[PDB]
Scaffold this active site. Structure first.
Site, PDB file in Angstrom:
ATOM      1  N   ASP A  31       0.816  -1.114  -0.011  1.00  0.00           N
ATOM      2  CA  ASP A  31       0.016  -0.064  -0.093  1.00  0.00           C
ATOM      3  C   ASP A  31       0.820   0.972  -0.074  1.00  0.00           C
ATOM      4  O   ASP A  31       1.665   1.573   0.777  1.00  0.00           O
ATOM      5  CB  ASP A  31      -0.711  -0.127   1.184  1.00  0.00           C
ATOM      6  CG  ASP A  31      -1.972   1.134   1.197  1.00  0.00           C
ATOM      7  OD1 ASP A  31      -2.191   2.019   0.452  1.00  0.00           O
ATOM      8  OD2 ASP A  31      -2.937   0.870   2.052  1.00  0.00           O
TER       9      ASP A  31
ATOM     10  N   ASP B 138      -4.124   6.953  -3.384  1.00  0.00           N
ATOM     11  CA  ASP B 138      -3.992   5.938  -2.351  1.00  0.00           C
ATOM     12  C   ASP B 138      -4.501   4.532  -2.852  1.00  0.00           C
ATOM     13  O   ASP B 138      -5.617   4.476  -3.300  1.00  0.00           O
ATOM     14  CB  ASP B 138      -4.850   6.437  -1.187  1.00  0.00           C
ATOM     15  CG  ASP B 138      -4.869   5.407  -0.096  1.00  0.00           C
ATOM     16  OD1 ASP B 138      -4.135   4.525   0.003  1.00  0.00           O
ATOM     17  OD2 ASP B 138      -5.490   5.813   1.026  1.00  0.00           O
TER      18      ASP B 138
ATOM     19  N   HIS C 127     -12.512   5.715   2.411  1.00  0.00           N
ATOM     20  CA  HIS C 127     -12.454   7.203   2.944  1.00  0.00           C
ATOM     21  C   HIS C 127     -12.420   8.269   1.808  1.00  0.00           C
ATOM     22  O   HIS C 127     -11.820   7.935   0.944  1.00  0.00           O
ATOM     23  CB  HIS C 127     -11.140   7.450   4.008  1.00  0.00           C
ATOM     24  CG  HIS C 127      -9.864   7.060   3.480  1.00  0.00           C
ATOM     25  ND1 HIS C 127      -9.011   7.751   2.629  1.00  0.00           N
ATOM     26  CD2 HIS C 127      -9.459   5.710   3.414  1.00  0.00           C
ATOM     27  CE1 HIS C 127      -7.853   6.967   2.423  1.00  0.00           C
ATOM     28  NE2 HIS C 127      -8.261   5.826   2.824  1.00  0.00           N
TER      29      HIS C 127
ATOM     30  N   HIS D 187      -7.277  11.221   4.715  1.00  0.00           N
ATOM     31  CA  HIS D 187      -8.683  11.006   5.168  1.00  0.00           C
ATOM     32  C   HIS D 187      -9.325  12.402   5.434  1.00  0.00           C
ATOM     33  O   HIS D 187      -8.960  13.050   6.560  1.00  0.00           O
ATOM     34  CB  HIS D 187      -8.420  10.318   6.484  1.00  0.00           C
ATOM     35  CG  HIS D 187      -9.829   9.547   7.045  1.00  0.00           C
ATOM     36  ND1 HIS D 187     -10.973  10.374   6.968  1.00  0.00           N
ATOM     37  CD2 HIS D 187     -10.017   8.244   7.534  1.00  0.00           C
ATOM     38  CE1 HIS D 187     -11.963   9.395   7.347  1.00  0.00           C
ATOM     39  NE2 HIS D 187     -11.420   8.067   7.487  1.00  0.00           N
TER      40      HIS D 187
ATOM     41  N   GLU E 242     -11.271   1.048  -0.493  1.00  0.00           N
ATOM     42  CA  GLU E 242     -10.598  -0.265  -0.007  1.00  0.00           C
ATOM     43  C   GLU E 242     -11.335  -1.188   0.739  1.00  0.00           C
ATOM     44  O   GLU E 242     -12.307  -0.921   1.334  1.00  0.00           O
ATOM     45  CB  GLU E 242      -9.308   0.277   0.683  1.00  0.00           C
ATOM     46  CG  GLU E 242      -9.432   1.279   1.945  1.00  0.00           C
ATOM     47  CD  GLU E 242      -8.212   1.830   2.614  1.00  0.00           C
ATOM     48  OE1 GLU E 242      -8.049   2.986   2.997  1.00  0.00           O
ATOM     49  OE2 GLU E 242      -7.305   1.002   2.615  1.00  0.00           O
TER      50      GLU E 242
ATOM     51  N   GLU F 208      -7.246  -1.518  -3.105  1.00  0.00           N
ATOM     52  CA  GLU F 208      -7.801  -0.321  -2.886  1.00  0.00           C
ATOM     53  C   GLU F 208      -7.490   0.457  -4.175  1.00  0.00           C
ATOM     54  O   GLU F 208      -6.259   0.283  -4.815  1.00  0.00           O
ATOM     55  CB  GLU F 208      -6.856   0.319  -1.996  1.00  0.00           C
ATOM     56  CG  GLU F 208      -7.151   1.824  -1.730  1.00  0.00           C
ATOM     57  CD  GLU F 208      -6.409   2.447  -0.280  1.00  0.00           C
ATOM     58  OE1 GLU F 208      -6.842   3.224   0.510  1.00  0.00           O
ATOM     59  OE2 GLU F 208      -5.223   1.825   0.040  1.00  0.00           O
TER      60      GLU F 208
HETATM   61  C1  LIG Z   1      -6.650   5.064   8.919  1.00  0.00           C
HETATM   62  C2  LIG Z   1      -6.629   6.721   8.992  1.00  0.00           C
HETATM   63  N1  LIG Z   1      -7.583   7.190   9.976  1.00  0.00           N
HETATM   64  C3  LIG Z   1      -7.459   8.548   9.960  1.00  0.00           C
HETATM   65  N2  LIG Z   1      -8.474   9.369  11.061  1.00  0.00           N
HETATM   66  C4  LIG Z   1      -8.250  10.576  10.720  1.00  0.00           C
HETATM   67  N3  LIG Z   1      -7.172  10.416   9.821  1.00  0.00           N
HETATM   68  C5  LIG Z   1      -6.766   9.386   9.411  1.00  0.00           C
HETATM   69  C6  LIG Z   1      -5.832   8.832   8.264  1.00  0.00           C
HETATM   70  C7  LIG Z   1      -5.646   7.549   8.276  1.00  0.00           C
HETATM   71  N4  LIG Z   1      -4.783   7.030   7.227  1.00  0.00           N
HETATM   72  C8  LIG Z   1      -3.324   7.097   7.573  1.00  0.00           C
HETATM   73  C9  LIG Z   1      -2.515   7.604   8.298  1.00  0.00           C
HETATM   74  C10 LIG Z   1      -1.209   7.354   8.257  1.00  0.00           C
HETATM   75  C11 LIG Z   1      -0.861   6.853   7.267  1.00  0.00           C
HETATM   76  F1  LIG Z   1       0.564   6.896   7.086  1.00  0.00           F
HETATM   77  C12 LIG Z   1      -1.706   6.281   6.242  1.00  0.00           C
HETATM   78  C13 LIG Z   1      -2.855   6.413   6.191  1.00  0.00           C
HETATM   79  C14 LIG Z   1      -3.950   5.919   5.528  1.00  0.00           C
HETATM   80  N5  LIG Z   1      -4.335   5.415   4.052  1.00  0.00           N
HETATM   81  N6  LIG Z   1      -5.885   5.295   4.287  1.00  0.00           N
HETATM   82  C15 LIG Z   1      -6.138   6.093   5.140  1.00  0.00           C
HETATM   83  C16 LIG Z   1      -5.209   6.244   6.033  1.00  0.00           C
HETATM   84 MN   LIG Z   2      -6.797   4.403   2.165  1.00  0.00          MN
HETATM   85 MN   LIG Z   3      -3.879   2.681   1.178  1.00  0.00          MN
END
Ligand SMILES: Cc1nc2[nH]cnc2cc1-n1c2ccc(F)cc2c2n[nH]cc21
Ligand SMILES: [Mn+2]
Ligand SMILES: [Mn+2]
Length: 366
Positions: A142, A153, A222, A230, A252, A347
């Protein structure tokens, strides 16, 4: 200018006019009325809105073409026996070159995930990790690219033992179903219910045990925003707000032979500034310095410890802990199902353009 083998030419240089290849363009699904959404394709006003954002879609497409070329290269050499560090470094070296890394204006959107087996997401090696990829491993690759904060993404799963083939098929089908169901005015919970139904229609046998594939209920797709992986809307992958014109989504899905729930496990490698936290004055010198490094190099994009090491930073762990404790940075530890379970992921990033739905990261591979 043609691409080399191995790839080294920036995508920029392959398309000197600055017009990059479109992804898969799709008509929106029929409305709940049962009537067509095809009118969007030929609407003169939707065409105008769409063209008004052509610069933005083109940035996503540059980033997606980099993603396609990187992943085709990865698939050609990724093999058991390689260390996880070797895999991530080789991938990232290629990604930096093809995206034409340029500070916060072009680069890597987030660290290279290579989560193994029961771990579904957010594992990348830290320094000194001696983990080696094994023949029986199921590895989720990923990784993300961006141009001007327009993020791709996109993720796939790697295996070497055919015993996982039907698990991979279930997840691919589920992800494609989510993409198919996605559309303007579509409810997010409906996209999630469609994904679950497809995923759970598959049964698999691995080493003499049978399983009905389960979506991981606390992972999810997301919305994506500028420099914001996100952007605040979530897409369930089990049974439980609408998608809107101009939005961008990561669709995803994750399938599991375990409980279908993940927990935080193992050392943390992934971190990201809280998007909504503004300026916070810091006097503590190592903490101040690290925040400045983060602001200069990543901004609100995610990073990992290896990326601090490569910038020549050391003795930063207490400083990083401090930023986490202050709420300025958030840790994103690896997310794992039960020991002995197997997880898979696919994804894509999709653009909800006024005229059509573009699976901008689609390739001939997946
Ligand atoms: C899971 C998530 N949850 C969140 N709640 C608020 N902000 C958010 C960001 C993420 N998120 C990440 C965070 C850090 C990284 F290194 C890669 C991701 C990632 N890929 N798809 C979603 C991703
Ligand atoms: Mn993602
Ligand atoms: Mn991803």
């Amino acid at each position: 200018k043609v691409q080399t083998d191995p790839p080294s030419v920036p995508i920029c240089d392959l398309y000197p006019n600055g017009v990059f290849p479109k992804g898969q363009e799709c008509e929106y699904p029929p409305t709940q009325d049962g009537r067509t959404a095809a009118w969007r394709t030929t609407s003169e006003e939707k065409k105008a809105l769409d063209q008004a954002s052509e610069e933005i879609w083109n940035d996503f497409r540059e980033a997606a073409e980099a993603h396609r070329q990187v992943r085709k290269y990865v698939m050609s050499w990724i093999k058991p026996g390689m260390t996880m560090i070797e895999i991530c470094e080789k991938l990232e070296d290629c990604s930096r070159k093809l995206i034409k890394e340029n500070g916060l204006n072009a680069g890597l959107a987030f660290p290279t995930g290579c989560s193994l087996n029961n771990c579904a997401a957010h594992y990348t090696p830290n320094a000194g990790d001696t983990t080696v990829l094994q023949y029986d491993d199921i590895c989720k690759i990923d990784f993300g690219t961006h141009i001007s904060g327009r993020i791709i993404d996109c993720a796939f799963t790697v295996t070497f033992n055919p015993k996982y083939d039907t698990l991979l098929k279930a997840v691919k089908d589920a992800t494609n179903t989510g993409i198919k169901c996605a559309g303007i005015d579509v409810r997010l919970c409906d996209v999630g219910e469609a994904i679950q139904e497809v995923m759970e229609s598959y049964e698999v046998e691995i080493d003499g045990k049978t399983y009905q594939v389960k979506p991981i209920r606390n992972l999810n797709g997301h919305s994506i925003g500028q420099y914001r992986i996100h952007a605040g809307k979530t897409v369930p992958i089990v049974k439980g707000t609408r998608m809107e014109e101009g939005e961008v989504y990561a669709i995803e899905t994750f399938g599991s032979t375990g409980k279908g729930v993940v927990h935080d496990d193992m050392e943390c490698s992934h971190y990201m500034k809280n998007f909504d936290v503004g300026h916070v004055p810091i006097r503590l010198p190592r903490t101040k310095h690290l925040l400045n490094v983060i602001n200069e190099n990543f901004g609100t994009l995610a990073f990992c410890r290896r990326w601090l090491d490569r910038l020549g930073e050391s003795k930063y762990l207490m400083a990083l802990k401090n930023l986490c404790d202050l709420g300025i940075v958030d840790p994103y530890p690896p997310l794992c199902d039960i020991k002995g379970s197997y997880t898979a992921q696919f994804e894509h990033t999709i653009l909800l353009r006024p005229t059509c739905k573009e699976v901008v990261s689609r390739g001939d591979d997946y």
